[PDB]
Structure 1
Amino acid sequence: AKRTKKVGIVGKYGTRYGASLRKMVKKIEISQHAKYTCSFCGKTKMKRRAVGIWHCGSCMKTVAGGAWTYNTTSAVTVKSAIRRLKELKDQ
């Protein structure tokens, strides 16, 4: 059954800290605790160990990433731009 109608993971916070703060931390908590797909071994075992540590359960490979998500928009744009600079510098 559907236990709660519009509050998700932050239902653990009861009636504290305010609705706007709770719904602001909701998405971050969901992303932080979500399991991602390891780009190396293909398994869905990329779990966050600490702030910016993403370890693979079976692949046994750990990656530096965002604080709440595996990747960050700034990082992916930076990587793409730096790849373009690399290829353009040597043509």
Structure 2
Amino acid sequence: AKRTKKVGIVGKYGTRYGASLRKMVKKIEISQHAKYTCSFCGKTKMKRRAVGIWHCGSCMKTVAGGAWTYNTTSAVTVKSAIRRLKELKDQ
């Protein structure tokens, strides 16, 4: 809290849009601009390019992910289920 007590990323917006909305945006607004780790090389370069598409700059691995996160929870839970059923079918 060097410059701001409690706005951070959403200090750009100034007074506008209301407190709740700006608090609500701060979560996403952070995550979406986060640089994640490319589970492919392991550098911290997974960066959202456009909605649902994240690109490693080093790996050059474009990756269909979430709108504001490299992974949605939904996607993750769906992944594991499919893996479980796959194993249940084939044996």
The DSSP-based 3-state class of the residue aligned with 1:63 is: strand
Q: CA deviation at 1:20?
A: 0.3
Cα RMSD (Å) of the superposition?
0.9
The DSSP-based 3-state class of the residue aligned with 1:13 is: coil
1:2 matched residue in structure 2 = 2
TM-score, normalization by structure 1: 0.98
Instruction: Give CA deviations for 1:7-62 in whole Å, capped at 9, x if unaligned.
Output: 11000000000000000000100000000000000000000000011000111110
In structure 2, stretches of 5+ residues that fail to align are none
In structure 1, stretches of 5+ residues that fail to align are none
TM-score, normalization by structure 2: 0.98
Q: CA deviation at 1:90?
A: 1.3
| Identical counterparts, % of pairs | 100
In structure 2, C-alpha distance between the alignment counterparts of 1:52 and 1:90, rounded to whole Å: 32
Listed as ranges, the matches of 1:46-85 within 5 Å are: 46-85=46-85
